[PDB]
Amino acid sequence: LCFTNVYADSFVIRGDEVRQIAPGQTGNIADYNYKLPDDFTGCVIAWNSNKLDSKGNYNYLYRLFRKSNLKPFERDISTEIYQAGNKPCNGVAGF
């Protein structure tokens, strides 16, 4: 079947959140980093890369603290420490 404007994405996946990256659920890494629209287009594609990617290497560190949940068509590139208290978070780690 013919199609146009096919976009590609790359994202490290543990393996058990593939069922949750789809709309209607949020995974361990799909709660704060990856997302899909309400009715995702295209198809789910995956293969095995644990043998070669793993050696560990924390370059692909997944975000865990942030302001809120994900909205469609957004990029989580802001690396700000979550402010869960009245005291400002400037000054590295705090309570």
Epitope: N28, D31, N69, A84
Partner: nanobody, 126 residues
Framework: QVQLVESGGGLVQPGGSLTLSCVAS????????VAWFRQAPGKEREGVSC??????????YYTASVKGRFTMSRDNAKNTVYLQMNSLKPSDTAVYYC?????????????????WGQGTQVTVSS
């Protein structure tokens, strides 16, 4: 703005059982993770157990001291979490607090720590 009320604590003999109640008000805890904390006097806060919004055992965490003896259970149908707390040791004597945040899933190293209740006293002795 969410308010948590811990209850169910009291005096118990070693090996006994108790059920702690963390009543939430002014909000729904259903889409947010809820964790239990306890502090003994002189000792800092430490986690006890955490349950995610999905309430699966894989998303439910227990600390090493409580694994296999405490039971974490939440009722998102009626907005409350319960720590089923059995086979008591004197080392479990502490003020038990329940905590929640806007996070939806617990991790073994991350518990919700935004909003706290007044806590309940659990004492395991004669």
């Amino acid at each position: 703005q969410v308010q948590l009320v811990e209850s169910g604590g009291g005096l118990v003999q070693p090996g006994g059982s108790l059920t702690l109640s963390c009543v939430a008000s002014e909000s729904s805890l259903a889409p947010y993770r809820v964790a239990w904390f306890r502090q003994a006097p002189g000792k800092e806060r430490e986690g006890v157990s955490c349950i995610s919004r999905d309430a699966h055992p894989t998303s439910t965490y227990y600390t090493a001291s409580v694994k296999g003896r405490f039971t974490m259970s939440r009722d998102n149908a009626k907005n409350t979490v319960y720590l089923q707390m059995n086979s008591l040791k004197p080392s479990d004597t502490a003020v038990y607090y329940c905590a929640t945040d806007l996070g939806g899933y617990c991790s073994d190293s991350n518990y919700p720590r935004a909003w706290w209740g007044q806590g309940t006293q659990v004492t395991v002795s004669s």
